Amino acid sequence: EVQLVESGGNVVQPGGSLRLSCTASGFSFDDSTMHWVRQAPGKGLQWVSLISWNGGRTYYADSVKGRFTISRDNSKNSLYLQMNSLKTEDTAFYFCAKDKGDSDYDYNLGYSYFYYMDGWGKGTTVTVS
Amino acid sequence: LENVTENFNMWKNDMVDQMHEDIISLWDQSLKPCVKLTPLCVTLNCSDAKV
Ligand SMILES: *[C@@H]1O[C@H](CO)[C@@H](O)[C@H](O)[C@H]1NC(C)=O
Numbered sequence: 001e002v003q004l005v006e007s008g009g010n011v012v013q014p015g016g017s018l019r020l021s022c023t024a025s026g027f028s029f030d031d032s033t034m035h036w037v038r039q040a041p042g043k044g045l046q047w048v049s050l051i052s053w054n055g056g057r058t059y060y061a062d063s064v065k066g067r068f069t070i071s072r073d074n075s076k077n078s079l080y081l082q083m084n085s086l087k088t089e090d091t092a093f094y095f096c097a098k099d100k101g102d103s104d105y106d107y108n109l110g111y112s113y114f115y116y117m118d119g120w121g122k123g124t125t126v127t128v129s
Numbered sequence: 130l131e132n133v134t135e136n137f138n139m140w141k142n143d144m145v146d147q148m149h150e151d152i153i154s155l156w157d158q159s160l161k162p163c164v165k166l167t168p169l170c171v172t173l174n175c176s177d178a179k180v
């Protein structure tokens with residue numbers, strides 16, 4: 001049993017910035033990778049960003065690679081995803097979801113990391129302009 | 130030799146059999162130390178070549 005909580009969403013304007021705080025507990029972040037997706041009304045899921053324990057494997061989706069950055073720390077076990085240069089078609093409920101972080105190792109091929117969300121947070125809110 | 134006769138069947142000759150054996154071993158020995166290209170073959174995404 002794990003819980004994820006997010007806060008900091010409010011009215012936003014295009015070209016502005018917003019600070020989003022997403023704390024969680026019940027699972028250590030030392031060996032956990034956090035995801036980010038958004039759920040616009042009437043539409044399917046969309047991938048936003050990915051992050052590893054320290055760095056690398058922080059790949060971003062094609063349409064949201066402009067100036068979006070995600071950072072993590074171990075001191076207080078929380079995550080951030082600051083919104084920047086908000087467009088007029090990127091308004092939706094952003095969701096942060098835990099990942100199991102399973103892997104595999106073959107001497108010839110090397111480390112292979114699999115990705116699939118396990119736990120999900122309550123959800124945030126966005127409103128352009 | 131001056132005046133002597135002998136017969137032999139080359140198909141039963143073992144000089145050729147030994148030559149095949151050691152030549153095969155020689156090639157294997159030369160390839161022992163240097164790298165093996167096992168990791169290379171993965172899912173390759175190939176369409177065509179510009180040239
Ligand atoms: C390296 O490990 C320390 C351990 O406390 C952690 O605080 C730090 O964030 C790690 N490095 C990075 C780049 O996060």
Ligand SMILES: *[C@@H]1O[C@H](CO)[C@@H](O)[C@H](O)[C@H]1NC(C)=O
Nearest residue numbers: 130131132133134135136137
């Ligand atoms: C063999 O040949 C030699 C010459 O090369 C000859 O002198 C001798 O008589 C021959 N022997 C036989 C058995 O034919």
